[PDB]
Scaffold this active site. Structure first.
Site, PDB file in Angstrom:
ATOM      1  N   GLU A 179     -69.258 -93.673  45.244  1.00 25.87           N
ATOM      2  CA  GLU A 179     -69.092 -92.185  45.466  1.00 25.87           C
ATOM      3  C   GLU A 179     -70.407 -91.482  45.274  1.00 25.87           C
ATOM      4  OE1 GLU A 179     -66.682 -90.723  46.595  1.00 25.87           O
ATOM      5  OE2 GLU A 179     -64.915 -92.060  46.330  1.00 25.87           O
ATOM      6  N   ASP A 206     -67.483 -82.155  47.554  1.00 24.56           N
ATOM      7  CA  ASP A 206     -67.220 -83.150  46.481  1.00 24.56           C
ATOM      8  C   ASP A 206     -68.336 -83.053  45.474  1.00 24.56           C
ATOM      9  OD1 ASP A 206     -65.074 -84.318  47.973  1.00 24.56           O
ATOM     10  OD2 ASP A 206     -66.606 -85.529  49.094  1.00 24.56           O
TER      11      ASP A 206
END
Length: 129
Positions: A35, A52
């Site tokens: 991520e 995000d």
């Protein structure tokens, strides 16, 4: 902070992620690598006006509030700015809510595509824990 692999494993284990809801520590370390590349200040644009944020790339449509995402829900009750800190506590506490939501770590598409299935224990190989 950009963590090293074992450094983040140890921090995640101090914050209660090892075997949280049945997911071993290597899952969490693998998810963080794919991520954010272990970078607590990472941010990425996502769909529907969202972004995000942080080490586990928590998204602003459902989980944190960034003041700029239409429709947003804030289920972690935290400003997304608070996830951009070198201290992982806010991101770990929100991650614990996401993984408890019914679908486990599948919420993290990078984990679902690049970690799930694999020998995730290799991500804590050699670490002092």
């Amino acid at each position: 902070k950009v963590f090293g692999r074992c450094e983040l494993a140890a921090a995640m284990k101090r914050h209660g992620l090892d075997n949280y809801r049945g997911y071993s520590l290597g899952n969490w370390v693998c998810a963080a690598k794919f991520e954010s590349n272990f970078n607590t200040q990472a941010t990425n644009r996502n769909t529907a006006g969202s972004t995000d944020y942080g080490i586990l790339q928590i998204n602003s449509r459902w989980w944190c509030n960034d003041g700029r995402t239409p429709g947003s829900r804030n289920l972690c009750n935290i400003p997304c700015s608070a996830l951009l800190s070198s201290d992982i506590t806010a991101s770990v506490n929100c991650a614990k809510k996401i993984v408890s939501d019914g679908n486990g770590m599948n919420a993290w598409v990078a984990w679902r595509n690049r970690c799930k299935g694999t020998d995730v224990q290799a991500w804590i190989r050699g670490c002092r824990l």
